[PDB]
Design a protein around this ligand. Structure first.
Ligand code: MG
Ligand code: MG
Lengths: 186, 1040, 26, 120, 49, 133, 120
RNA sequence: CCGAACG
């Protein structure tokens, strides 16, 4: 129940602070011990998803913690992959919150692009919430960096294999589903 | 978002400049000519309405002895003032724009274009004036100029105001509220484009109607050498930085920074940085000053609710603009402290740790004030010397408001959804609702409630308001948002939510998660009640418990019977409940300073001067109740040693009576329960009653000692074990202490927190025996009980537990049984009453006026003396004549006699819902004469059974004396003629009633019941013919 | 210490007057 | 109190100066203004707001909105004075009989051109 | 007319007695012929249209 | 509530002599039916000695009509320049206006609330009395 | 008529403090108390004048003597109990707080002689 | 930071 007591502490820290500066500093002086750092980050996601919509608090404090120590950065990326695993059970508001936070940090180099491999683009592989969250994050980052900015960044050979699933070349059925879906996004 | 969407707004390539002017119409209302207004109104409305509107403005304005006729202004407190203001301002808008730029901004009459949009881009770009709004008397204009347009303008300006010296820049108004790089610069082309568009728009207005004033205006140019476009619109300072210009570093990060998208390109092309105006902060601070400058003597709870409304208005209006306004964060800390210390000052105790966060921030449910908070947040403030230059970011921050531990009171922001998010969510939920109806209404499966709960507090009109009781008669409510704005000129309360209205907007915020997170952050409702006098009410759980509001006894009793001689006397009660309830934390021992007086006769230490607290605690341990609790617990431990009087090797220990001032002798103790025991039994070494082990060495004879002494714990010291061990360890070691045995073993009791413990030398067969004894003592005593009930009355904390059946009509036979039943009427003291139904005798003890020569209170002293005289009868009575049930009529006497019946704790005390006419007993000639004829206090034995019950029953003569008492209460000058039918119809002198035979007795009792029934029906508009058995019997005896 | 930051007097403002350094600074 | 007195001296004098120094709006400022408004309203294909009709479909909903608004000042109200109690009485009357309230209102708009003293 | 410590009744006018533009026509005339010209041009053009 | 019965006008006038022109709630106390606002209005709209209740001159009518075209519907402004009171000015102008043209929706309904009872002449004391009067 | 002022009350709270101190030594001298208990009780008297006397009610500037004796107590108690010595009665290092109150008394002797001469 | 009198 001491993990419950730390979720108490970290939640209570987030709900008791104003700016991501204050929340982060107070958290880091709670004495978060290594190995349990993820216990904060998921709470850093969870409450953020429970918020009626985006207070940029979450992406702010997270992208401040990522370059503060890249351990929390890799934890955020791996928890993003885990969220890709289970987003099927997500309600659309917490979904939009998590997606917009992850894309907002994405446009700002606070996490590696490798985490974006978790997107397949097959229709047998894309449930409804999957493609919905996808359109959300895509419009979000296409806003945060720009149309030409994303068209430049994402086409890079150094980014090529990491867009393997999201742009499938093995089946033109996949190509057509990707083209039509992403066009329906914006 | 409209500034962003004007085409090529941010391009400064060809020297194009963007100007953002904002100004009010300077005496706009003051200067409405009523003849011109009349003429212009006749253009838009019926001439009769125009003429009514015009005449309504031409009135006399009076203040006290001052008066004048309004001939020139507009009366702003008119209800349709807003309509005149908005139409007149529309006329001034057409003056500013011309009927072509106005007809392009507005769009065709058939297809008008929305707020800041145009039909084309050829129409949009034709004219410098790009964006335009007027908010009642305040104008915001955005122009975009060619450098040819800008140059022509600056020319004409300077050729009109020639100043060679370059004194142009000196008196310019651009706000210092922003950092120094980011504000508008001092370029000559930019300062001059500012002043030139101000001057050129100010020339557009006939100065007989209005002007613009440069000091109540603000222009901001976005040019080559100026990257940001500034304005302040409503309380919001807005600084828009585009990407193309001086960002140079791709920035999308902060909570209160809005990302401006293009509607076409969909790229975030700019960021709007929001603060709150210095006018917004002054507004809020004045609003708190005004709360703090209140009726002067207000409850803590209205000070707290008015703080809460002020704070909710501030935070729920500005939401994210509060973020990057640091002077607001300091203002909020300072002002929330201010509210708290006004509340504290309400107790003459400004001390922290008397009033920890728990007292203010715990919900009203848990007896706290319920204050919301934005003050317990670190205040980020960066290096002073450089911070205004470049927006450096914060390296340091300050502790905003102090906690009690590593505590944290949840900040009220995080429960208010940002405005940017609210507007994105609203775009979504309302766009999807549009498609959902646009799709389903033809499909005939039209939208319904719970088709939408993905959106229920969502949408800027909540998608909550289509499903409203009045959605038919709120489609006719137009102009309601102006209406609400304009209500400040009509009422002298200023609505903090002038900007919103639930019947149309929805609720737009929800702070329930806030109250649950504040409970969790206070340590849950249990860790909150640790600070409270709960656990001193002995309510087993907090759950089944509810608070009195008392709003049931404000209007229900009286309209004008309340006076200013009694006004604050009533506004003190809810601070008394609050103070009594937090006294564990308020009157706590670790205070910084405070003289620590021990209360009059109790073992309560007051550290400092809390007057309300002392009065509460002084009428809770009234009637020497500290003495009584000590007596009862020591008495009953000796009786548990009359209960186990032979099992162990002991003697009769009876009720050791000693000096009464010993319970509250808080330094030294002595002479608790009698020691005497026959043989020798083998004692322990000094351990705590908590364990059970270690029976041990030498055992002396008749030296078997226990000491039970009470306590009133504080929140910060209620640890009973440590206290009892220390008391033992202290003055068994000390010489001032008379302990016949070297084993004077200590038992402590916490009267405040209802705990118990012991520490000393255990004499075997004790810890399982004393543990048993105490665990049964702390639930059973009459003394602890009358404590818990005195405390419960003080707190007005009630359960749904309330005690056993009253004397209600369903029990009129139970008093006739073999047990001696007692009644009492403590209203007529004076003389006290005792009504025994079973025997027909009366204990009419008359009280002399000398027992009220100079006694403090009439009613208070009389109510207690009545119980004490009942106790003096219970004393001077034998044991075989004592009662078992004592029904009291007036509910006030339940308190004292229960304490007086602790020595006889067997007699039952309970209330009575039934009413009896013992008042009518003093309407008898004998009772009305003899008692006032008596000179000195005397007991008058009596008999309501003059000659009756020799053959007639007890219940039968009771059903006779019922109508007797009722017709004496009402009829009395009519019951005379029944009881005075003839001079020769005689009575006995040694009895009150004239006794007749059974036929005439029954006829007279039938007349006596008719007197009550035909006199109740005519005052109740109630027929005497449909009266039932009970419908008659419930009125004839007493009250239903 | 007071390296040019904030309140000179912690008397009439309503905090205890402590200036903590950001554990979030880069 | 001192500032309301001072403001009212200034404002009494402003009202006097208007009647001495005459309409500030010039006869050919007022006509340019009136004409701009005419050409605007005519460009907008605007139709005047007519006198509230007799058999006006919305007349009672608008009155009920009015009365709700007027009542709303009295939903927290704890002690009222004779004009606030009189107001609540007339709001109650106009809720009780909307039709005679409406007829009074229309008779006021039609006829009433002199009104009582406003308190400031 | 504020004070009366004695209560003396003062005659109604012994109380009242002790211590007690031409552009308007131009404006209303201009406005009235403006009304007239506007009305006539409206009726003329709207009945020929 | 209701029009002024002539006893009230005379108590109000006696009180204006006793109390002056600024004690309207002191004067309001003699009269049980009337409030200080109504006493003040009755004095200024009907019982001011400086009110000309005489018949209307015809220098005054042409002043009234000049003004009603100069300051249209501004009867509080118009009234001191004519010398009458705004209700006198108002109904006199209505009379003259019907003189040109030579039920009505423009007249008091039975049970309606009269707006200005303080402008109408006092209902005279009746042959009887009441313990109120 | 029995409401006394700050001179009377300051005099008698000062006399209550000297009673407390004198009584501490008289308890030592009757034998009822150790020398260690005398020293701890004297340092207690001097560190707890705001709890034991109430003298700050009649001269509230002597909150600075009380704050100073509280700071002195924090320092002395911290430096005293370092090691196994721990956390309770027993520290009797009373000369620091004694001299705080002696400075109070030297500076307030002239003020109080004035006030009491005026009362007399 | 922190408490007394009076009104
Ligand atoms: Mg005074
Ligand atoms: Mg006085």
């Amino acid at each position: 129940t001491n993990l419950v007591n730390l979720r108490r502490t970290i939640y209570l820290t987030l709900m008791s602070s104003f700016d991501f500066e204050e929340a982060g500093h107070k958290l880091l002086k709670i004495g978060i011990q290594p190995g349990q750092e993820i216990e904060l980050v998921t709470m850093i996601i969870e409450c953020c998803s429970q918020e009626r919509t985006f207070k940029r608090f979450y992406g702010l404090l997270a992208q401040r913690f990522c370059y503060l120590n890249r351990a929390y950065a890799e934890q955020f990326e791996d928890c993003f992959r885990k969220q890709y695993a289970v987003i099927h059970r997500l309600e659309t508001n917490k979904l939009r919150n998590v997606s917009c936070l992850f894309a907002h940090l994405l446009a700002t180099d606070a996490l590696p692009w490798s985490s974006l491999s978790c997107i397949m683009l097959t229709e047998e592989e894309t449930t409804s919430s999957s493609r919905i969250f996808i359109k959300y994050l895509f419009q979000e980052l296409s806003s945060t960096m720009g149309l030409v900015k994303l068209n430049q960044r994402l086409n890079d050979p150094a980014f090529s294999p990491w867009f393997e699933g999201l742009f499938p070349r093995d089946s033109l059925g996949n190509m057509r589903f990707s083209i039509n879906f992403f066009t329906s996004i914006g | 978002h409209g500034i962003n969407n004007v085409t090529n707004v941010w391009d400064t390539n060809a020297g194009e400049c963007v100007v953002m002017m904002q100004s009010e119409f300077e005496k706009m209302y003051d200067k409405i000519d009523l003849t011109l207004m009349n003429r212009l109104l006749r253009l838009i409305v019926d001439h009769n309405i125009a003429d009514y509107i015009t005449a309504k403005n031409n009135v006399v304005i009076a203040y006290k002895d001052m008066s004048h006729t309004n001939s020139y202004g507009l009366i702003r407190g008119l209800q349709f003032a807003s309509f005149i203001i908005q139409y007149y301002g529309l006329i001034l808008d057409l003056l500013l724009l011309g009927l072509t730029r106005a007809t392009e901004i507005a769009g065709p009459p058939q297809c008008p274009n929305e707020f800041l949009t145009y039909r084309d881009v050829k129409t949009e770009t034709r004219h410098p004036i790009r964006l335009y709004s007027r908010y009642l008397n305040k104008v915001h204009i955005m122009f975009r100029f060619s450098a040819e347009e800008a140059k022509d303008l600056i020319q004409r300006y300077l050729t009109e105001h020639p100043d060679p010296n370059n004194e142009n820049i000196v008196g310019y108004n651009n706000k210092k509220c922003w950092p120094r790089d980011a504000r508008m610069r001092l370029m000559k082309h930019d300062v001059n484009l500012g002043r030139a568009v101000f001057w050129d728009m100010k020339n557009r207005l006939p100065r007989s109607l209005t002007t613009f004033e440069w000091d109540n205006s603000f222009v901001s140019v976005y040019s080559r050498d100026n990257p940001n476009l500034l304005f302040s619109m409503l309380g919001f300072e807005v600084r828009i930085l585009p990407k193309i210009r001086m960002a140079a570093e791709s920035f999308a990060n902060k909570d209160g920074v809005w990302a401006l998208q293009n509607v076409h390109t969909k790229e975030r092309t700019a960021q709007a940085f929001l603060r709150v105006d210095d006018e917004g902060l002054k507004s809020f601070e004045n609003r708190v000053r005004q709360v703090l400058m209140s009726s002067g003597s207000t409850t803590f709870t209205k000070i707290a609710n008015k703080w809460n409304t002020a704070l909710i208005g501030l935070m729920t209006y500005y939401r994210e603009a509060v973020l990057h306004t640091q002077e607001l964060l300091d203002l909020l800390v300072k002002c929330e402290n201010k509210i708290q210390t006004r509340i504290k000052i309400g107790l003459n105790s400004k001390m922290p740790s008397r009033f920890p966060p728990v007292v203010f921030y715990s919900p009203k449910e848990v007896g706290g004030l319920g204050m919301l908070s934005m003050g317990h947040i670190l205040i980020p403030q960066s290096d002073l010397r450089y911070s205004q230059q470049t927006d450096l970011g914060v390296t340091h921050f300050r502790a905003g408001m102090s906690h009690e531990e590593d505590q944290l009171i949840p900040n009220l922001y995080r429960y208010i959804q940002p405005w940017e998010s609210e507007f994105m969510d609203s775009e979504r939920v309302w766009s999807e609702y549009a498609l959902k109806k646009e799709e389903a209404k033809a499909q005939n499966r039209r939208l319904t409630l719970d088709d939408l709960d993905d959106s229920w507090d969502r949408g800027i009109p909540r998608i909550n308001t289509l499903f409203q009781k009045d959605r038919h008669t709120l489609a006719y409510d137009r102009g309601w948002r102006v209406r609400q704005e304009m209500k400040m000129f009509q009422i002298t309360k200023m609505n903090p939510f002038w900007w919103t209205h639930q019947k149309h907007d929805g609720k737009l915020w929800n702070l329930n998660n806030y109250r649950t997170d504040v409970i969790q952050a206070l340590g849950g409702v249990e860790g909150i009640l640790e600070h409270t006098l709960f656990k001193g009410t002995y309510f087993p759980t907090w759950e089944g418990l509810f608070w009195e509001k008392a709003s049931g006894f404000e209007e229900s009793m009286k309209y004008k019977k309340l006076t200013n001689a009694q006004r604050s006397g009533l506004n003190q009660i809810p601070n008394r409940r609050f103070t009594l309830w937090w006294s564990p934390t308020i009157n706590r021992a670790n205070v910084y300073v405070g003289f620590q007086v021990q209360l009059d006769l109790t073992g309560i230490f007051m550290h400092g001067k809390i007057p309300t607290l002392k009065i509460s605690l002084i009428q809770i341990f009234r009637a020497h109740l500290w003495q009584k609790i000590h007596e009862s617990v020591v008495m009953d431990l000796c009786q548990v040693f009359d209960q186990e009087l032979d099992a162990l090797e002991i003697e009769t220990v009876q009720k050791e009576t000693i000096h009464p001032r010993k319970s509250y002798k808080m330094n030294s103790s002595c002479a608790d329960i009698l020691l005497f025991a026959a043989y020798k039994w083998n004692m322990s070494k000094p351990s705590l009653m908590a364990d059970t082990n270690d029976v041990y060495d030498q055992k002396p004879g008749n030296k078997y000692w226990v000491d039970v002494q009470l306590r009133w714990g504080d929140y910060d010291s209620h640890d009973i074990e440590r206290y009892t061990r220390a008391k033992f360890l202290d003055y068994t070691t000390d010489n001032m202490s008379i302990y016949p045995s070297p084993t004077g073993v200590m038992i402590g009791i916490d009267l405040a927190y209802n705990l118990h413990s012991a520490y000393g030398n255990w004499f075997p067969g004790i810890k399982p025996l004393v543990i048993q004894a105490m665990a049964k003592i702390m639930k059973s005593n009459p003394a602890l009980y009358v404590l818990r009930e005195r405390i419960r009355k003080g707190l007005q904390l009630y359960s749904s537990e309330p005690t056993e059946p009253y004397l209600s009509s369903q029990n009129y036979g139970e008093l006739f049984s073999n047990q001696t039943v007692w009644f009492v009427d403590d209203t007529n003291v004076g003389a006290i009453f005792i009504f025994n139904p079973r025997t027909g005798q009366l204990f009419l003890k008359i009280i002399h006026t000398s027992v009220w020569a100079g006694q403090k209170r009439l009613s208070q002293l009389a109510k207690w003396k009545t119980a004490e005289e009942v106790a003096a009868l219970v004393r001077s009575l034998p044991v075989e004549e004592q009662p078992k049930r004592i029904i009291v009529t007036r509910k006030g006497m339940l308190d004292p006699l229960e304490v007086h019946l602790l020595d006889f704790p067997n007699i039952v005390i309970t209330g009575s819902e039934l009413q009896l006419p013992f008042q009518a007993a003093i309407k008898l000639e004998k009772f009305g004469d003899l008692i006032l004829k008596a000179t000195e206090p005397q007991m008058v034995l009596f008999n309501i059974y003059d000659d009756w019950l020799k053959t007639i029953s007890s219940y039968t003569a009771f059903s006779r004396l019922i109508l007797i008492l009722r017709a004496l209460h009402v009829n009395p000058e009519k019951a005379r003629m029944i009881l005075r039918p003839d001079k020769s119809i005689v009575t006995q002198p040694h009895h009150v009633w004239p006794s007749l035979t059974d036929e005439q007795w029954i006829k007279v009792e039938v007349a006596l019941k008719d007197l009550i029934l035909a006199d109740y029906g005519k005052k109740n508009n109630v027929n005497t013919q449909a009266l039932t058995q009970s419908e008659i019997r419930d009125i004839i005896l007493g009250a239903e | 210490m007071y390296n040019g930051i904030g309140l000179v007097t912690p008397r009439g403002s309503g905090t205890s007057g402590y200036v903590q350094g950001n554990k979030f600074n880069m | 109190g001192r500032l309301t007195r001072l403001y009212l001296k200034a404002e009494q004098e402003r009202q006097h100066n208007y009647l001495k120094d005459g309409p500030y709006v010039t006869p050919e400022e007022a006509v340019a203004i009136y004409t701009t408004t005419v050409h605007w309203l005519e460009s907008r294909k605007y139709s005047c707001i007519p006198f509230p009709p007799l058999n006006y479909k919305h007349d009672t909903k608008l009155l009920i909105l009015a009365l709700e608004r007027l009542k709303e000042q009295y939903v927290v109200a704890v002690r009222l004075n004779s004009s606030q109690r009189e107001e609540l009485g007339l709001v109650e009357q106009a809720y009780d009989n909307p039709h005679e309230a409406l007829q009074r209102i229309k008779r006021h708009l039609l006829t009433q051109r002199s009104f009582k003293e406003v308190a400031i | 007319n504020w004070k009366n410590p004695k209560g003396y009744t003062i005659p109604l006018d012994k109380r009242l007695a002790a211590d007690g533009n031409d552009k308007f026509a131009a404006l209303s005339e201009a406005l009235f012929t403006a009304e007239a010209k506007a009305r006539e041009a409206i009726t003329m053009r709207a009945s020929i249209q | 509530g209701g029009v002024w019965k002539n006893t009230e006008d005379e108590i109000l006038k006696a009180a204006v002599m006793k109390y002056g022109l600024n004690q309207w709630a002191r004067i309001s106390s003699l009269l049980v039916r009337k409030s200080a606002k109504q006493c003040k209005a009755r004095w200024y709209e009907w019982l001011d000695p400086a009110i000309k209740k005489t018949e209307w001159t015809r220098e005054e009518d042409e002043k009234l009509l000049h003004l009603a075209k100069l300051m249209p519907c501004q009867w509080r402004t118009i009234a001191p320049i004519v010398g009458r009171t705004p209700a006198q000015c108002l109904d006199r102008y209505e009379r003259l206006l019907d003189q040109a043209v030579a039920d009505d929706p423009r007249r008091l309904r039975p049970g309606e609330i009269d707006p200005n009872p303080e402008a109408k002449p006092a209902r005279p004391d009746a042959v009887d009395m009441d313990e109120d009067e | 008529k029995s409401r006394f002022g700050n001179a009377f009350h300051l005099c008698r709270e000062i006399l209550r403090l000297t009673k407390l101190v004198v009584d501490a030594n008289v308890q030592f001298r009757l034998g009822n108390v150790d020398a260690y208990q005398l020293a701890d009780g004297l340092q207690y008297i001097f560190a707890h004048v705001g709890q034991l006397t109430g003298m700050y009610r009649y001269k509230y500037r002597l909150m600075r003597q009380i704050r100073m004796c509280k700071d002195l107590k924090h320092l002395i108690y911290y430096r005293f109990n370092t090691g196994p010595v721990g956390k309770g009665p027993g520290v009797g290092f009373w000369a620091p707080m004694w001299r705080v109150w002696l400075f109070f008394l030297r500076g307030i002797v002239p003020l109080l002689e004035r006030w009491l001469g005026n009362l007399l």
